[PDB]
Symmetry: D3
Subunit: 149 residues, 6 copies
């Protein structure tokens, strides 16, 4: 029942990786509980990157994330926060192992295809930020085969 925030970045949209990314999370056994394709504006972007407001690359982060639509998602499951980062791979795509999303698809840190919450507290914050409206809840018929007890 842990939940995490996964965002496909503008480059992930442009390079036609939306379905592929979602499939990795689906096949893993995680539950998609929220999803929307959205164009972000500066003021929202500034809130998402709030932790980095004092960084000199802050403006570039904001300039980029508004330059194309992104796909915002909430995924739910056991250890989905840390396992979500494992699926995504390392920060630098070139250090990311084949088999991970960044390992298979990315080469440039500034074009790293996807974002995943770095921690349970970051996730709760990110989810409240991106999905004020809440989630589209459901119960998977495969629950008893994905999970024990």
């Amino acid at each position: 029942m842990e939940s995490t925030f996964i965002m496909i970045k503008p480059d992930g949209v442009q390079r036609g990786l939306i379905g592929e990314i979602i499939s990795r999370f689906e096949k893993k056994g995680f539950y998609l509980k929220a999803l929307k394709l959205v164009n972000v504006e500066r003021s929202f972007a500034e809130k998402h990157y709030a932790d980095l407001a004092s960084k000199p690359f802050f403006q570039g982060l904001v300039d980029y994330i508004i330059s194309g639509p992104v796909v915002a998602m909430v995924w739910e499951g056991k250890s989905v926060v840390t396992t979500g980062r494992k699926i995504i791979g390392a920060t630098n795509p070139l250090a990311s192992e084949p088999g991970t999303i960044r390992g298979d698809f990315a080469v440039d840190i500034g074009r790293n295809v996807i974002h995943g919450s770095d921690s349970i507290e970051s996730a709760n914050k990110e989810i409240a930020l991106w999905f004020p409206e809440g989630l589209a809840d459901w119960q998977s018929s495969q629950h008893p085969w994905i999970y024990e007890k």
Copy 2:
């Protein structure tokens, strides 16, 4: 620039087919312009299936679409309304071709995984219904390789 409405039905979500379906439209070269996971309510379901209100099965259609979340999508491209439906495949399982979405995944007309607009006219209507908020516009850098001129 033609657009169509495409919905992954409750069985599509439950059977873990969301990414696979999206990948097929992406690889075809179509542009995703709206996307969301939603739990549908009765009156909205009744509006969506309005054309069938006098049919005996109308109630069943409504009950089912409200029984689980769906993925609502808008796709844009040349002839996307009919080509969208070609990729989806015939309604009747006996008539579906291997290589289409229903040809590959569906065995029951009542569990047909996905549904696309019949016409430009009905698409316009479905888009206005499902996405009052409008679309997330963008321009693909692959445009000049997908389309001539």
Copy 3:
């Protein structure tokens, strides 16, 4: 609940297509009820192809099937007999459409990868012949999403 007999021929095994073929039936929503890797003896082969003993290429069918192990399967589902044949594609892989098993993988009628029962009465005979030990029964937790009611 209808069932059909599906057999991967010795060329299917040799060309490493066992998993791919099984995945196709699984993804379609059919239920695997029996499965084994078998070396076939001539008298058994002759029983399998009994309804063809009068023909000249009867010996040809028989020799082919004893030339290496085969994978014998029972698949269960709505219209699985006809649908099984549709997925397999035309007998002459030259006429087989891309998206079918023979359309994707085969070029020669004498190496056409796989066999599916041609009718319900043939399926019942074949299942009785290959699996007198019975089937492995189970209920899929995805049943209510693959089938209506």
Copy 4:
């Protein structure tokens, strides 16, 4: 010519992963020498898990493995025992690397999809238990390109 015992557990069957799993071993270049779908009997399962008999989670293992059919397999090839384990991934899916079977597909240690022999000695034991009748026989035409010498 080394051989190992690989078993797709009931959740692998239910989640439709049979073909995918077989494909990974085929593509690696390993040779399938035995295959059956089976419903496991309780006293048989108690034997298979004997080495864990005095462990706490022992009865749970026994209860679970007879709760649905499994796919029992023998695979042959150089270092197939250790390499089969490498393909399968870490026991705890929390640790399993993307690109491995459990890394790609599993989230719960109690629903970890598949089993492979842990050593040559376990393999011999498991193979004698599950396939007392022995193996199917064949020689791959790809042998001289998979192996040297």
Copy 5:
């Protein structure tokens, strides 16, 4: 031993479809006998499209084929000419069937991803023009499982 000329057009290259296209011919059982990535020069293009010199779309064809590199190939196998064309699918994207290359990837007749010889006579001519240096020869270890006799 029949051979055909298959060429991936600049849009096929730009959209990253090179490996995918080659895979489809490999899996079918055909033999790659010649292969090169090449930039095409205007007068060579004029020669390739010579038979269309009187047509008003001639110059557009010439401009387009030289706007990017192409992957020129020779494939060999039974009925490879007509089957090559079948794998490629209909010229017009409103007609291309899902499961074919154009069916799966193309939406515009002017950006149709790939070319295949339309007849044995055309093949022979194209092969002589594009590969006067001849072919690379080899024999596939899979020949006896792809072909009978």
Copy 6:
């Protein structure tokens, strides 16, 4: 703009892995700049392996590489030399991780499917030797989405 030499060995061609290998490089975001199917002649093989001329296994290497056609390629991108080797996986398939080319496909060090340049120095020498004719020039429409700036 760094470039590397990647060669699919005879076993990779025989096993029908050509397209699958190319796809992995395309999907990562690298640019194919040279590609051809070649029958290597003894004196050229001796040049390619010149660095190992004093090794006892030198003649074995030479014998193998001329036994069947290879696919020679040049790929370009950020850190493509080291990244190429990462995608390919460990030299010994006992160590190669699932997700890498050798991880997924190879089991014998002597049949390790593919080779990539081990350094920028080696890559330059290899590119000069295999592609004296030079590289294809083109600019990917995806460049601004693969690379920042």
